Design a protein around this ligand. Structure first.
Ligand SMILES: OC[C@H]1O[C@H](O[C@H]2[C@H](O)[C@@H](O)[C@H](OCCCCC3CCCCC3)O[C@@H]2CO)[C@H](O)[C@@H](O)[C@@H]1O
Ligand SMILES: [Zn+2]
Length: 128
């Protein structure tokens, strides 16, 4: 029930689970950064690059994912595999039960603006 966090690396713009927070600093420009240890230690901007951890979606609740939603998406390309922000553009709804969702979510990645068709098993929702 404790709050848990993910942080966005300024190295590759992808999100990583935070194990703990070590210290902080203020840049001369006024920006506040925290030093995080990941579940390697990095400085990350508090305002833009630390948030409550994204949440897996169970097959029985795939209806809660809607066009326009911000999702954390598993983006696998070549031998690179990053968790990146995307927005759901389109949903092809499938016939399925509680065991496995077969709906297809077309996502558009925020950073490079590319699109990919993903299953529920590669996307996580934001809290609230
Ligand atoms: O965006 C918000 C977001 O809602 C919030 O979760 C995010 O979390 C605030 C960062 C948490 C810093 C750390 C947490 C554990 C140890 C003490 C301090 O801040 C963002 C900007 O203030
Ligand atoms: Zn579904």
């Amino acid at each position: 029930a404790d709050l848990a966090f993910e942080a966005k690396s300024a190295r590759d713009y992808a999100w990583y689970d935070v194990s703990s927070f070590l210290t902080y600093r203020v840049l001369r420009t006024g920006e506040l950064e925290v030093r995080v240890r990941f579940s390697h230690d990095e400085w990350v901007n508090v305002k833009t690059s630390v948030r409550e951890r994204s949440i897996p979606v169970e097959p029985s609740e795939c209806g809660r994912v809607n066009v326009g939603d911000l999702m954390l998406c598993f983006q696998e390309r070549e031998d690179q595999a990053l968790y990146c922000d995307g927005h759901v553009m389109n949903i092809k709804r499938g016939i399925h039960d509680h065991a496995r969702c077969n709906c297809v979510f077309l996502v558009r990645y925020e950073l490079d603006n590319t699109e990919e068709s993903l299953g529920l098993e590669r996307i996580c929702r934001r809290p609230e």
